Amino acid sequence: MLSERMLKALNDQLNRELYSAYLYFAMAAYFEDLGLEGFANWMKAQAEEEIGHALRFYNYIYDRNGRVELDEIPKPPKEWESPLKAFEAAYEHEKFISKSIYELAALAEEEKDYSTRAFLEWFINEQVEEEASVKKILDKLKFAKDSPQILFMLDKELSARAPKLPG
Amino acid sequence: MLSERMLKALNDQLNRELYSAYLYFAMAAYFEDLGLEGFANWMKAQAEEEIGHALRFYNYIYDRNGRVELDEIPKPPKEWESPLKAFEAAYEHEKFISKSIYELAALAEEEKDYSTRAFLEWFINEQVEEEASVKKILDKLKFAKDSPQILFMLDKELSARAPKLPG
Amino acid sequence: MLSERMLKALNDQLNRELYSAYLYFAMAAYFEDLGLEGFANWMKAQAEEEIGHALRFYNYIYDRNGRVELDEIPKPPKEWESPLKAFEAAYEHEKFISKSIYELAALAEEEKDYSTRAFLEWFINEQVEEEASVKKILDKLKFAKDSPQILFMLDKELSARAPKLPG
Amino acid sequence: MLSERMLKALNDQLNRELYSAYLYFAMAAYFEDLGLEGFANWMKAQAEEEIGHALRFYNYIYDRNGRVELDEIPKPPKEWESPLKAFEAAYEHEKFISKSIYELAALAEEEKDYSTRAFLEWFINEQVEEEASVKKILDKLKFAKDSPQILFMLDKELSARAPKLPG
Amino acid sequence: MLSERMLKALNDQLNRELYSAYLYFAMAAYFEDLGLEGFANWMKAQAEEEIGHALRFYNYIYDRNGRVELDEIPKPPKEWESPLKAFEAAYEHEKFISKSIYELAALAEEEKDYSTRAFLEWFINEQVEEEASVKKILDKLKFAKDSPQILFMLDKELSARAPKLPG
Amino acid sequence: MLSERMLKALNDQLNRELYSAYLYFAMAAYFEDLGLEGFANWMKAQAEEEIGHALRFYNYIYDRNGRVELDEIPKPPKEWESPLKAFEAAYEHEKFISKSIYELAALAEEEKDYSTRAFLEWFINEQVEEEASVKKILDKLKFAKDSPQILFMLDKELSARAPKLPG
Ligand SMILES: [Fe+3]
Ligand SMILES: [Fe+3]
Ligand SMILES: [Fe+3]
Ligand SMILES: [Fe+3]
Ligand SMILES: [Fe+3]
Ligand SMILES: [Fe+3]
Ligand SMILES: [Zn+2]
Ligand SMILES: [Zn+2]
Ligand SMILES: [Zn+2]
Ligand SMILES: [Zn+2]
Ligand SMILES: [Zn+2]
Ligand SMILES: [Zn+2]
Ligand SMILES: [Zn+2]
Ligand SMILES: [Zn+2]
Ligand SMILES: [Zn+2]
Ligand SMILES: [Zn+2]
Ligand SMILES: [Zn+2]
Ligand SMILES: [Zn+2]
After folding, report:
1. How far is E56 from chain D (nearest CA, A)?
2. Per CATH, which fold does C1-167 belong to?
3. Which of B11, B12, B25 best probes binding to A when mutated, by most A CB atoms within 10 angstroms?
4. Nearest 5 degrees, angle CA C57-CA C63-CA C65?
5. Which residues contact F50 (CB under 8 A, 6 or more apart)?
6. Has F81 been labeled as part of a binding site?
7. CA distance linking residue C60 with residue C49, whole number of Å
8. At C163, is the secondary structure helix, strand, or coil?
9. How far is the CA of C18 from the centre of ligand 12 (A)?
10. Geometric angle at alpha carbon A86, from A85 and A90, rounded to 5°
11. Coil, strand or helix: which one is F73?
12. Is there a binding annotation on residue D53?
């Protein structure tokens, strides 16, 4: 009841979700280097979120009697020219995630796989939130061009989102 | 501060920690496919603990004015002949991770880098617990040779260890 | 990420929701004039619900990086031959809102805009409830054809539903 | 609002759902005879759930202004070869139900009936869970093969899911 | 310990009880269609109660080390000429179950099966209540011949009895 | 108790207040697009306040045995040159609502309509407040001519005022 193609598509997205976690952990390291602790914790918190998304693929796969197969998680970028560029890369990446979700949806429909299509709805909706939440901070960063002081207030704002795990 | 050498080593161990998380996750998938849910959650909680180890390194690197750099995380193995052998693999893996920390401690000593050596004390003590805790379940698995009854009983026992993340 | 046609379809529906609100408000004034406070309050409530529905479109548009544009809200009918007929109007209107949601859904499907189709799923479900609730009352007003004592009893039953805004 | 065909199909499913209630009640009786109270209760609980599923259909039909019509509910099988074969037949049954939901979902997509399709989503997702929890127990049963000890421990484990009605 | 004939006659009644539920379920549909939610909900609660009667037999059968066997459940009528007539049908049905119970108690007496006669005492008392409670609504319904207003008010009263299951 | 003149004047102001709501809603959209979420929520809060003003007129018309008649609501402006320009437009709207109210005061005194004039005393006092609260912010925006720093700190202050209804 998972086709061979579907299963592979699902394990691929699971791998994509794990890669996103690593990308954000990477940006976390990057902002930590800048001394933007607030940004760093925001990004660690976003990594954990992505781990969560992978678990959803992981559970659905097992629920349909599939087998999960873990793949390498690529080396994420080390650096960005700026917090702005880093968020632009996050936004570009979220768009990439979405695109792959639509393709999975398109695949489920093409296979008349109602179950998988339906499981994907959650992701279609989540990605809307994901894209908006990155874009919002991205635009705020545009708005703070030659302004250290704003970057600092944004940092302080963003420190409100802390990773759950270190506890 | 940190020599260039010391920092490559810390970074490299950091990625070993991340690799273990991933290894344990793979073991989790393996047990899950076997319908051993208790084993699977124990492995996921282990996975999480490894992320915590990574983060200790991450934090120490930054305290010392260093820069985390994150490498690819190689595809773990997908499969094992048996619950027992999975745990034999885990026990070997912790043994290896303990050899890594010895190596790193020795490097610290050679460099007269007291701080890193001090930092590593925590891991020398942690690894004693890690190895011991893996050994306990391994022996129980040896004890359960050809007795599904006991395997079932062990699955339940280990279901008392849960990943904090899902909620 | 919203097509120019879609943003238009969405802004239009938003507007349609505000006009629903205004119509129900007109119906409140009608009942208020008949001294049927229970009906009048019920409509003030529905009016608020509809504003809510509009706000949902507004939020979604901004989330997908869109721009809401507000249009004129047309003058609603002042008067109805009777309670029953007013509810006959309200029902038909709900059916018109329903068909315009279905056309948006179909548009989203034509365009392969999965986000927008997933968002419309909420309104598809909502309208099922909306029609069923106007129909239930419509039907009791049929059953009270020339029997004021029942009209009086319904009015009291519907005062159960309060508009939230006055306090 | 409901095509004559859609209604026939919805009522058809409603009846499938009661038959499921009844089939699980047959199995409950079967397990009670074997002296397996845990299994038996699990099934009574499942029977209740299926009645819940029929009510989901009843309510949707009335929201949509159609008319429920009840049919005869066939005699279920009295007996199975073993706990395992009984759970295999439940698994096959759940598969047959899932296929009924899909065919219905298809019918709705063909009729451009967006309200009925949206209604059915709940069941699409529900069936995933349904098939999954039968499977999980069906494997627990395969893994018992020649072991009263384990079937006993399973019976106890399942006794934790109790039917509500008795209260 | 139960005679073949007794065992059939108990299982026979089990099936008669389940049919009751099924019949009350039809009436609930019937009322529901008419717009009378109170009467509908009353009938579902009644249906729910009849399932409890089936169960009492079921448990008694296994208590006596017998084996329940479930038979087809006939299609109930779809419609009645009026709520009163539906109530007349329910009254006539409860009168039917009672006789069934008297006949059952008689056979137990003839066969000198004290235990089953003892078990049936509960039903003899229950039917008095069953029959009385239906008659009472039946009469209130006679009292309301050509009066909608009372059908309304009655409906409201009945609504106070709610089926447990949906919760 | 109301002159055909008064009834018209009041219905007119009713309609003016409703257009006010819409004007501020439009402005909320303008700010939302700027990514100024505080400003946008403040404008929604102001929007709901205007609907309140609307209701006040409504209730009063009905207390004097009048009949409310709703008019079309004109399309408001889509945009402004700047946050400052938008508040200059807002202020200048409040002055126009003020003048409108003063004219009703005069109209009601012109025909010795004591009740309506005393009713209006609430609005004369409310408008003093409305204008001061818009002026306060308008000035604050002047004082921050070219200063994203300050425009950002302001946005944060105004976020403390939230629309009530979402809920
Ligand atoms: Fe998210
Ligand atoms: Fe440990
Ligand atoms: Fe609603
Ligand atoms: Fe379920
Ligand atoms: Fe009773
Ligand atoms: Fe004010
Ligand atoms: Zn994700
Ligand atoms: Zn994401
Ligand atoms: Zn470790
Ligand atoms: Zn370890
Ligand atoms: Zn609406
Ligand atoms: Zn509506
Ligand atoms: Zn079902
Ligand atoms: Zn089911
Ligand atoms: Zn009974
Ligand atoms: Zn009865
Ligand atoms: Zn005002
Ligand atoms: Zn104002």
Report:
1. 9
2. Ferritin (1.20.1260)
3. B25
4. 110
5. F17, F18, F20, F21, F24
6. no
7. 17
8. coil
9. 10
10. 115
11. strand
12. yes
**Please, do chains D and B touch (3+ CB pairs < 8 Å)?**
yes
Q: Which residue has the tokens 């004890």?
A: B143
Q: Could you please report the per-residue DSSP string of D19-60?
A: HHHHHHHHHHHHHHHHT-HHHHHHHHHHHHHHHHHHHHHHHH
- Peptide-bond breaks in chain E following residues (C–N over 2.5 A): none
Go through A48-76 and write b for each residue having 16 or more CB atoms within 10 A of its CB, e for each that does not: bbbbebbbbbbebbbbbebebbbbebeeb
Q: Which tokens sit at B58?
A: 């991450």
Distance D134 CA to ligand 8 centre (A): 32
Q: Give the C-alpha separation, F42 to B90, whole Å.
A: 58
Q: Which residues of B77-114 are buried (b: 16+ CB within 10 A; e: fewer)?
A: eeebeebbebbbbbbebbeebbebbeebbebbeeeebe
Q: Which of left, alpha, beta for D112 (phi over 0: left; psi -120 to 50: alpha)?
A: left
F148: chain A residues, CB-CB within 8 Å: 143-144, 147, 150
State in Å, rounded, how far the first CA of chain F is from the last one.
Answer: 39
- Do B62 and B54 touch, CB atoms closer than 8 A? no
Residues of A with CB under 8 A from a CB of B: 22, 25-26, 29, 32-33, 48, 51-52, 55, 58, 62, 67-76, 78, 164-166
DSSP state, residue D165: T
Q: Which of E97, E96, E90 is nearest to E139 (CA)?
A: E90
Centroid of ligand 8 to alpha carbon of C67 (angstroms):
24
The answer to whether residues C103 and C16 touch, using CB atoms and an 8 Å cutoff, is no
- 8 Å CB contact between D134 and D87: yes
Residues of chain C neighbouring F14 (CB-CB closer than 8 A): none
Residue from A124, A127, A135, A137 whose CB has the most chain C CBs within 10 Å, to mutate: A124
B43 φ, ψ (degrees, to nearest 5): -65, -45
| C-alpha of residue F17 to centroid of ligand 9, in Å | 66
Mutation site for B-interface testing, chosen from D87, D142, D145, D149 by largest number of B Cβ within 10 Å: D149
Integer Cα distance of A77 and A27 in angstroms: 8
Distances (CA, A) of B165 to A15, A21, E86: 18, 14, 56
Contact (CB<8Å) E58/D165: no
Q: Do B94 and B130 form a contact (C-beta atoms < 8 A)?
A: yes
Structure tokens at A56: 């959803």
Amino acid at F9: A
Residue in A114, A119, A121 nearest the CB of D102: A114
Query: What CA–CA distances, in Å, run from D113 to A74, C92, E34?
Result: 45, 18, 25
The set of residues, in sequence order, having a beta carbon less than 8 Å from that of D112 and lying 6+ positions away, is C102, C106
Phi/psi of residue F70, each to 5°?
-90, 140
- Chain A residues in contact with chain C using a Cβ-Cβ cutoff of 8 Å: 98, 101-102, 105-106, 121, 124-125, 127-129, 131-132, 135
Cα–Cα separations (whole angstroms), residue E41 to E28, E30, E120: 7, 11, 29
* Resolution in Å, one decimal place: 2.8
Among the partner-chain residues F51, F52, F72, the one whose CB lies closest to the CB of C72 is F72
- What is the distance between the alpha carbons of residues D150 and A37, in angstroms, rounded to a whole number? 53
Kindly list the domain boundaries of chain A, sorted by start residue: 1-167
Amino acid at F8: K
SS3 of B73, please? strand
Closest-CA residue of F relative to A154 is F152
Structure-determination technique: X-ray
Count Cβ neighbours within 10 Å for each residue of F123-161 and write b for 16 or more, e otherwise.
Answer: beebbeebbeebeebbebbeebeeeeeebbbbbeebeeb
